[PDB]
């Protein structure tokens, strides 16, 4: 019953000459919506590209198309002249960005997936693997005998799996000693209480 | 910035490859399949909560094709740079002998959006049981792709993600082995 809404790609302006293991030619278009404080402030950004170079961009903060390279001037001038075209692009903050936000809020914004925490040594350093969680806002802490160790933590960063889950490995550069008790602590919005996993020599 | 919903399209010549996909904070919501002309939800559950007419996405690719001709002419047929890919191979969960797992092949920071990817178990091409994502859009406006291969780990199996891209002279072989799991990281 909820329907996504597409943003129309606008035609460029006919205005150029001619010329000439095969060469390739790419054109990208990215209608992107940015959301702040939930759905309070919304920046729409109707961008047009050629290869990897940005050509022309509409900004909701600016209110008109403005060129990003000199080749985009013909297009920016052509589009701003259309009166009705600009209105839709200005109202896109509500027409399209906010609409598509509400359509998928259930399974995108409010998507929670429990991590799975795992502790093992290798290389003798200790690894805290945290796999398969959404979103990516996560904090990992290493405790050495009930004493947080903010020195020696090399985190691999957030690693995108591509299936709407992240993974990350936090390694602690500590001599395992003996009898010592290392603990990995994971705080994540999908949990009700901070997870902890211990490992003894 | 809390969240970003990108609707991304691209068109490539002479290959005549088109793409139309939505993005939410770096992961794909859905893409329209150009062959079958239907929406393809990256996670199947999504389709139970939302819908999208895929015929509207085709009209957008038509304009993309038009714009691409205009741009190509307006640049005296200036080509794209073959920007080589960046490839690492990692596993979904920390490898444990005889437990179901998945090998992930991360292809990153490349363009044009054209690549040949082939999994190799012990030097031989793996035919069935491979999944792959559409070309995901980066923010420096290159591309990124995911190729999956579920598997059952053992010490008698080595793997390789063979990535062929026009930015490269030879195919790129990233080797995975049970003994050397986290070495790359």
């Amino acid at each position, epitope marked *: 019953a909820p329907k996504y809404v597409k943003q129309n790609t606008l035609k460029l302006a006919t205005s150029g000459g001619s010329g000439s293991t095969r060469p390739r030619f790419l054109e990208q278009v990215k209608h992107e919506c940015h959301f702040f404080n939930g759905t309070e402030r919304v920046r729409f950004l109707d961008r047009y590209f050629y*290869h*990897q*170079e*940005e050509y022309v961009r509409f900004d909701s903060d600016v209110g008109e198309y403005r060129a*990003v*390279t*000199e*080749l985009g001037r013909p297009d920016a001038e052509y589009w701003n002249s259309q009166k009705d075209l600009l209105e839709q692009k200005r109202a896109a903050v509500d027409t399209y960005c906010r609409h598509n936000y509400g359509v998928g809020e259930s399974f995108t914004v409010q998507r929670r997936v429990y991590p799975e925490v795992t502790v093992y040594p290798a290389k003798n350093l200790l690894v805290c693997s945290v796999n398969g969680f959404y979103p990516g806002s996560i904090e990992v802490r290493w405790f050495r005998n009930g004493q947080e160790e903010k020195t020696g933590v090399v985190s691999t960063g957030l690693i995108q799996n591509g299936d709407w889950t992240f993974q990350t490995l936090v390694m602690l550069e500590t001599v395992p000693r003996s009898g010592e008790v290392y603990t990995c602590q994971v705080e994540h919005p999908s949990l009700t209480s901070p997870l902890t996993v211990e490992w003894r020599a | 910035e809390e969240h970003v919903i990108i609707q991304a399209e691209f068109y490539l010549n002479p290959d005549q490859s088109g793409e139309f996909m939505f993005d939410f904070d770096g992961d794909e919501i859905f893409h329209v399949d150009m062959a079958k002309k239907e929406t393809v939800w990256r996670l199947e559950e999504f389709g139970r909560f939302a819908s999208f007419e895929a015929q509207g996405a085709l009209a957008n690719i038509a304009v993309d094709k038009a714009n691409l001709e205009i741009m190509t002419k307006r*640049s*005296n047929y*200036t*080509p*794209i*740079t*073959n*920007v*080589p890919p*960046e490839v*690492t191979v990692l596993t979904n969960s920390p490898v444990e002998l005889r437990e179901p797992n998945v090998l992930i092949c991360f292809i990153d920071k490349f*363009t044009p959006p054209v690549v040949n990817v082939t999994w190799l178990r012990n030097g031989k091409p793996v035919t069935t049981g491979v999944s792959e994502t559409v070309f995901l859009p980066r923010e*420096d*406006h*290159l591309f990124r792709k995911f190729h999956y291969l579920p598997f059952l780990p053992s010490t008698e199996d080595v793997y390789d993600c063979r990535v062929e891209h026009w*930015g*490269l*002279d030879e195919p*790129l072989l990233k080797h995975w082995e049970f003994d050397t799991s986290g070495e*790359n990281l």
Partner: antibody, heavy 120, light 108 residues
């Protein structure tokens, strides 16, 4: 995080050897390659060579094997040896990072630079 | 050895103004061109790679482009920090060759 820093002798007499090291942190020399670039005072930039992640080396032919670039992955530092130093070699030596083992991977992060003067 | 010749040698413009460097290749570098910035203290920061791929910590005013064998860096809305030495770089085949440079000066 990603850092490269050059270190070497300030003053090397002519007809001797110049050894500079490019200690790197933030990345692994097992996945990224390291280039060498020098800049004579006032003049432009000159590419010297590169040792890639897998150890394959490419030198600049003009340097007539007066160049020896080695790497020690485990200690995360690259090395540079200049032989038969002439007065022309007085310049500032840099190192830069590049992914993989192919020339078409652009360099990104550069070092701070080190000064080396060849005079008796 | 490929020859890289940069066109504006000592350009000097004002604040909030558009400039453009031109780097042209003797052979065909097939799009493998980077633009570097060298502040006077030696620091070398990369602006654009592979003809017109924008690096991460580079504003949108910097812009690479290509027409044939002509490569152009175009800095829009010139701001104070954007006044330094600029080199172009080819990396299609060994040896890597640099441009001559371009001293950019803030006219006040």
């Amino acid at each position: 995080q990603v850092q490269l820093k050059e270190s070497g002798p300030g003053l090397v007499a002519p007809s001797q050897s110049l050894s500079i090291t490019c200690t790197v942190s933030g990345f692994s020399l097992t996945s990224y390659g390291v280039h060498w670039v020098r800049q004579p005072p006032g003049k432009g930039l000159e590419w010297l060579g590169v040792i890639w992640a897998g150890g394959s080396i490419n030198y600049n032919s003009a340097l007539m094997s007066r160049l020896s670039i080695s790497k020690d992955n485990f200690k995360s530092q690259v090395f540079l040896k200049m032989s038969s130093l002439q007065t022309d070699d007085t310049a500032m030596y840099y190192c830069a990072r590049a992914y993989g083992d192919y020339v078409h991977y652009a360099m990104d992060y550069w070092g701070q630079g080190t000064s080396v003067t060849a005079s008796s | 050895d490929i020859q890289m010749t940069q066109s504006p040698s000592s350009l000097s413009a004002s604040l909030g103004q558009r400039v453009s460097l031109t780097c042209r290749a003797s052979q065909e570098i097939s799009g493998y061109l980077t633009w570097l910035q060298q502040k006077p203290d030696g620091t070398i920061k990369r602006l654009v790679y592979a003809a017109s791929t924008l690096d991460s910590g580079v504003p949108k005013r910097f812009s690479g482009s290509r027409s044939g064998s002509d490569y152009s860096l175009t800095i829009s809305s010139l701001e104070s920090e954007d006044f330094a030495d600029y080199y172009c770089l080819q990396y299609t085949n060994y040896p890597l060759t640099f441009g001559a440079g371009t001293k950019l000066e803030l006219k006040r």
